[PDB]
Amino acid sequence: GHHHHHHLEAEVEETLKRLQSQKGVQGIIVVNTEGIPIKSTMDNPTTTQYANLMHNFILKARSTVREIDPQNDLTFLRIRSKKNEIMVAPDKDYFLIVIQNPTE
Template sequence: MSVPPVPTSSVPPPPEAKAPASQQPAATAPSPEMEQTLASLTSHRSVLGYMLLSRGHPVTIIRHSGVVFEGEQGKKYAHMIGRVVDSVQGGLEEVSGDSGDTDEVRFMRIRTKRHELMISPDGRFLLAVLHDPTS
């Protein structure tokens, strides 16, 4: 019984194959449309920052902008945003009961004395934008 030869190639592997394990996988990479949206968001003067989060458990920060989302404070915001979205979605499921016609969260606005947090969840990501509504 002979072993078939292993094909060899002089073609280098694609760049994503060389990426360190700490970088985000291609499955969670934002689309070009998302990239354009994020760039547009940062151009508004009232925007203090944004967070693009994974939809998994635990929620992880894929990308962020703005000092308010740096370091431990950013991790706290990410965790809170994930909990708020899960809680609201759970409430919608509870209200619908056994009807099988569960609604889903599309957009949320949370306004405080100083800021407004806008959250837009989808199947893969949570996008949260913090802005100053007075400016």
Template structure:
């Protein structure tokens, strides 16, 4: 009789990341930091931050999401918050709250990102 090992079942987070891998990779190329935590327990699932920063970020994120959700419901009681973007002079914070997880991505302000040089950059065309 053969002993076949039962297939290992992936957790929800791993399945979610696999499903959205191209998007995740694109986002992480510009990310300065990332935090994914359980919305119900506030337990970190993935983080690029230190413990103290992680706790502070999740607490502030929860407050911002709560305020934004309330503002959305004031305007339309049946609508719900899907995405929150906060841009400062130097950074941009992208927050995607769901029922199970909250995803926070911190990236440098796009205007501060280095631009790849192109061969014709800075050259003026000669008039004909």
């Protein structure tokens, strides 16, 4: 029913595969829930910058989304910008972060 935990490893392999299939992507940054970049189509220095910082922004995002009332929990935090896109999906074990071009 509700998203707590699944057969993670298979779901991750599926989704990671799918993240590779979504064309327009420039740099996949798949990190553990603490910001550990397991796979990366983006530079290591760059992943180090984004993974830890974005995690902390996510922590805040959790705080503001919940600040209203414990109605909403963060399922996707997808930020789109001019140069590139930064899609961050909070998972309970992972974070599917993908830097893509400004294509939906």
